Specification:
The structure is a homotrimer.
Chain A lengths: L2 E2 L13 E4 L4 E3 L6 E3 L3 E2 L6 E7 L1 H4 L3 E3 L2 E3 L9 E5 L4 E3 L4 E9 L8
Parallel strand pairs in A: 1-5
Antiparallel strand pairs in A: 2-11, 3-10, 4-9, 6-8, 6-11, 7-9
The complex binds 2'-deoxyuridine 5'-monophosphate (3 copies).
């Protein structure tokens, strides 16, 4: 905070996603329902793109579900990760890579604004 | 019904998604499992595009999960929202914006049909 | 196994997704949490693309949730489907089409690798 999306890294050259870490240590239980985890990373996005926050498979398989989230092109707030412990108690350590940001083209349409 | 996708609106110019509302008042509980909510909006999509139905974050955080759904380019039926109450009883009022439609390019491949 | 993505089929010409079947008979219950189902299909993907594994709506409505999964362009392993029974006992028969692979453009960015 406030760090822009350009400070994010890719695991490897062919990785679709930019890694997102939580800035806090947080414990999640199933009965808590959706929680919004801070990343300290902020919009906006490159021109003509929008973003999608998705889970990392290794984290999904460990029982933390990330709800897919749309990041609008002109969002200037903090990108947060919407997450829920599926079945068990999940512990997120500070700096753990818990989600990924995918960049996608933003298609123009004549839809009324 | 039957309204085409062109009647949908964007919240703002840089919003990735087109808002989708339910045409009915519906109550959802966790034990009901996935439910398909009517929108009165119909395919098909613009040429060379397909659609993805995603949650709105403000609705996800209130405990209604929208399952990501693929809308095929040539689908001519009613676009429905697949939704589940996560932990608590959720009440959807008629006209509440509960999901969003994202348009994405449809890539051609040589895969057999 | 090992079959490449090019052996996948589309249901119809305008279908966004390539169908993915499980190679095993598997029973899933809610208390099992996320499970990774084998497909016998392998990366990598076409140049400048990445993949997203999504649910088929007819399967989602029957109570099997597929967690959206990112397939990296240069992944050479087996594409697995991350799935969870929502509320009830779900039985997957061998050869049942349980998910779909969507191909999307991979946008270049200056993000550090
Ligand atoms: O997982 C998410 C989803 C949304 N947002 C922020 C960016 C979006 O532009 C904004 C509004 O959300 P939606 O209406 O696009 O869902 O909230 C996030 O930080 N994380
Ligand atoms: O959330 C969804 C997902 C699918 N469909 C419709 C449009 C799709 O073209 C069709 C078949 O679904 P899939 O096989 O693409 O998942 O069902 C919806 O109305 N809502
Ligand atoms: O549903 C999924 C998600 C991921 N993967 C494989 C391909 C990805 O390239 C790799 C690493 O996963 P992620 O870090 O991209 O989530 O695991 C799958 O087989 N199925």
């Amino acid at each position: 905070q406030k760090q822009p999306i350009s400070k994010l890294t890719r695991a490897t050259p062919g990785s679709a996603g930019l890694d997102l870490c939580s800035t806090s240590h947080t414990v999640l239980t199933p009965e808590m329902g959706p929680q919004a985890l801070s990343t300290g990373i902020y919009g906006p996005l490159p021109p003509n793109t929008f973003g999608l926050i998705l889970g990392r498979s290794s984290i999904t398989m460990k029982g933390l579900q990330v709800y897919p989230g749309v990041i609008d092109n002109d969002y200037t707030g903090e990108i947060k990760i919407m997450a829920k412990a599926v079945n068990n108690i999940v512990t997120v350590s500070q700096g753990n890579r818990i989600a990924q940001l995918i960049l996608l083209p933003l298609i123009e349409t004549d839809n009324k604004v």
